[PDB]
């Protein structure tokens, strides 16, 4: 028993992290096969950042402008390309440590693990979720750009995030590895705001299943509810709506604990209106919405 | 900006994790050089656990009783030894992936990263601290035994914890890699209780420095305090006492933010007496004591 914010092992992704320098601007790229993926604003200067025309900045750039450093080796760049907001530096040499990998664009609510890098070197690993506003609450300093979010399906590293931007609040924005931004954000240093940040209800419900399973049970209560009437209440507290899919998803946990989702909804409903009255659940004083139904199943069945 | 519970990269330690089976009982061992370290209760059956005489259980055991499995290889065991509560299986082959390593016994308050394993396979990584009662609040299921806690000093993996036991509460106990238990715990399934779990004050003070640095500043206040008078108050809320060493330790953060420790103590003092009044600090509704002064410096300077 016990329940933690737990990242996948970083080891397989560690092998893929390289430094990418362009003039002054230096940051992290991801090396899979004979291609290094990095944010395209590696090309920009501090001033260029204010309003870049990348197309235009790319004209005065050749393969040899791009310093791909793998720890203390230099990969030869034999091609560069722009795919939405990432550069794809074709290098002579395939990453020998390339894992089985996919690029997936996550939906909001899905969680993934961040391997935070500086100078193309892992500093730390942590979990987080794609909020519904399409930000994440990372920890990221200058030089973190091109650090990646991943999940692992046993053998296979699924890459979902490349880190580009911080927004006032210390929330973060970035791209899939196809370089399409999550949410309405652009790689410019112009005004642009996150929308309302909603709570991921299905994730909060899974957390409570995770709570129950560990023997924190007190929030449980006599009442049941309907999807519709729980939403009437949720909406107000800025919770993502719940759906039959969310319910089907939670089934495993429902089956594990013998507590129908709709019962757990009633339990969660009261906590929304009455708060936690000083108590914790799994040593959290607030309702934790950064666990997928899978995160709990993973951690409470203990899959590897 | 942004601040997370962030584990070191697991990759270097991943290489060291092997399955160890003895009859029925199967769990994780750590493979460095020609030695595999595991909990000694690999030898016990379910019944033996109730009150084992290891010395005595070790008599009816030979090298060949111990199945050291490295993914899908079998390491030959050419020697076994008992060091307090760990076995040391001498094998023919040195782990080629052995990192630069040390074994350190941490003091309580120090944090380290857990790489949670089943069948000698990394399932997940998370940070935690050695509470002052000498428990940790892991997440650990049956098969997790012999999973290790580590820190990294740039090149060098420092191993501080091997996981043995869960206690009612879902708190956990275990050993240094010399197999001496942290705290008064024994590898028997007998009654034995954790002491009072105290809050790690120096760690809470660092968290607030971490808060300040990210622009959560509101808890800051007009008052200063003395070490003595803050303790008079702390004691009551079950906070670890503060010392001149704790103050010298926090200096870097004090210097970073221009806020004397004793000021931060006054700020923390009021929050102890008045609570947080619904507000969060770094999106935590309670005072987080699972960050070393180094954890913040690491994450907020961004060392690798
Ligand atoms: C990134 O380039 C890097 O790590 N290498 C230098 C960097 C990461 C960033 C630094 C602080 N925290 C982080 O996550 N990202 C940037 O420098 C991006 C680049 C240039 C500015 N910028 C920002 O993130 C800026 N944010 C905003 O401009 N904010 C709004 C869009 C809401 C205004 C700063 C102010 C520097 C954080 C672009 C976005 C291409
Ligand atoms: C470990 O052996 C393993 O993972 N491989 C089988 C296992 C880890 C444990 C299972 C549930 N959560 C965990 O962290 N540890 C044990 O089985 C240890 C072994 C045998 C019993 N035991 C316990 O942890 C038991 N706890 C207690 O006995 N509790 C007190 C000492 C306070 C009574 C259980 C009840 C099984 C959790 C010894 C301690 C050698
Ligand atoms: Na970009
Ligand atoms: Na033991």
Author numbering:
A (entry chain AAA), B (entry chain AAA): 1 to 304
From the paper:
The main protease (Mpro) of the betacoronavirus SARS-CoV-2 is an attractive target for the development of treatments for COVID-19. Starting from crystal structures of the Mpro in complexes with the Hepatitis C virus NS3/4A protease inhibitors boceprevir and telaprevir, we optimized the potency of the alpha-ketoamide boceprevir against the Mpro by replacing its P1 cyclobutyl moiety by a γ-lactam as a glutamine surrogate. In line with our original goal of identifying broad-spectrum inhibitors that target the main protease of coronaviruses and the 3C protease of enteroviruses, we also assessed the inhibitory potency of MG-78 against the Mpro of the alphacoronavirus HCoV NL63 and the 3Cpros of enterovirus A71 (EV-A71) and Coxsackievirus B3 (CVB3). Finally, coronavirus Mpros feature a catalytic dyad comprising a Cys…His pair, whereas enterovirus 3Cpros have a catalytic triad consisting of Cys…His…Glu(Asp).
